[PDB]
Design a protein around this ligand. Structure first.
Ligand SMILES: *C(=O)CCOCCOCCOCCOCCNC(=O)Cn1nc(N)c2cc(-c3c(-c4ccccc4)nn4ccccc34)nnc21
Lengths: 350, 17
């Protein structure tokens, strides 16, 4: 019979053995394992998405995207295990290289030097450049999604909320609401909840930069509108111009109902941070998404000048187009598509 | 977690030579 972890079957042998629990989520259960064929340590996620249309939709997206991406700062998929027939496929196992830690864990135990902050930010943005060049929005960047080895190599993982948004087509009104993790959620996810852009990822990165500078979240809202209050208590009330760029009448009126708050200077929040870092932080944590720095300009900022090298920063050969987005399909059809997409890894070992 | 090495010992840094 198959190996078992905390009561859960983990049917990944004989290739992968010696399973150890790492964690679970809405995303499913993760274990470390040893790959006996390649003689390397791996992480394996067990997913059981097939009863829920939204879970299928997200599994197909994550798999399609990561199988097509090839970049040093994005975690690859090594293998995918599932049953040899569609009727028997209840579970899917995704295998990746095992990383030592993540940025969340690291910031619980360790004040980082400016050098490490600077180098981590470079790699986050280097990977994000590739991701945004493909027309993908990540939509869930946060410290626990940034995997690291102690060699200081960093990889972005967790593409479960990711999607394609082809810029030939206006997606206003058609994007999923309530994306990102609360503390890392851009204001326009609250105020333009169906019409936000890839700029939401730059915001998340700004939140991550702030956390690396101080070892605590910058906007720790306890709930949905309290998040926006935290944001506004640092940034101040938006300018008249910024308010006028908010098309949703209801959201702009909600803002106009709020009591005035003043901008708190970045150097009063971060008295010992490098000034270039704070300047870049400001540009990422800009309220108006149309004024927020974009990934290439962030990379080109003076804070990152010792790493910025557009000849060693790959972009996607073949950006995703609108074709790859019509995945709003019955969950049985999505299952068929997941089966097809994983077939390249069949057969698996006994 | 602990034991974060010098940036010098990064695959990305080391290639750049
Ligand atoms: C300091 O005080 C700690 C004391 O310990 C000191 C020495 O400790 C070393 C011993 O190991 C400690 C255990 O560390 C566990 C951390 N492991 C990882 O981060 C391993 N890991 N590698 C990858 N890769 C990976 C991915 C994910 C992940 C997935 C996923 C997994 C597998 C296949 C596809 C996806 N999906 N995720 C969603 C959200 C977050 C993570 C995640 N998880 N861990 C992973």
């Amino acid at each position: 019979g198959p190996e078992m972890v905390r009561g859960q079957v983990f049917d990944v042998g004989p290739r992968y053995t010696n399973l150890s629990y790492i964690g679970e989520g809405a995303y499913g259960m993760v274990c470390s394992a040893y790959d006996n064929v390649n003689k390397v340590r791996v992480a394996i996620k067990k997913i059981s998405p097939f009863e829920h249309q939204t879970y299928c939709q997200r599994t197909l997206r994550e798999i399609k995207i990561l199988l097509r991406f090839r970049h040093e700062n994005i975690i690859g998929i090594n293998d995918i295990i599932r049953a040899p027939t569609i009727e028997q496929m209840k579970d899917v196992y995704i295998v990746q290289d095992l990383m030592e830690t993540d940025l969340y864990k690291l910031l619980k135990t360790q004040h980082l030097s400016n050098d490490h902050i600077c180098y981590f930010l470079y790699q986050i943005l280097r990977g994000l450049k590739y991701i945004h060049s493909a027309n993908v929005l990540h939509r869930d960047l946060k410290p626990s999604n940034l995997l690291l080895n102690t060699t200081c190599d960093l990889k972005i993982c967790d593409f479960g909320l990711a999607r394609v948004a082809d810029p030939d087509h206006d997606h206003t009104g058609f994007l999923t609401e309530y994306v990102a993790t609360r503390w890392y959620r851009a204001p326009e996810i609250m105020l333009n909840s169906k019409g936000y852009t890839k700029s939401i990822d730059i915001w998340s990165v700004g939140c991550i930069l702030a956390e690396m500078l101080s070892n605590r979240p910058i906007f720790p809202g306890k709930h949905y509108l309290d998040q926006l209050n935290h944001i506004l208590g640092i940034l101040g009330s938006p300018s008249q111009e910024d308010l006028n760029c908010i098309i949703n009448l209801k959201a702009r009126n909600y803002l106009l109902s709020l009591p005035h708050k003043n901008k708190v200077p970045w150097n009063r929040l971060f008295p010992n941070a490098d000034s270039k870092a704070l300047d870049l932080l400001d540009k990422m944590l800009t309220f108006n998404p149309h004024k927020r720095i974009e990934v290439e300009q962030a990379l080109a900022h003076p804070y990152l000048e010792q790493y910025y090298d557009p000849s060693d920063e790959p972009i996607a050969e073949a950006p995703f187009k609108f074709d790859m987005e019509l995945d709003d399909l019955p969950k049985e059809k999505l299952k068929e598509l997941i089966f097809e997409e994983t077939a390249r890894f069949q057969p698996g070992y006994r | 977690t602990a034991q974060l090495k010098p940036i010098e010992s990064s695959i990305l840094a080391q290639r750049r030579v």
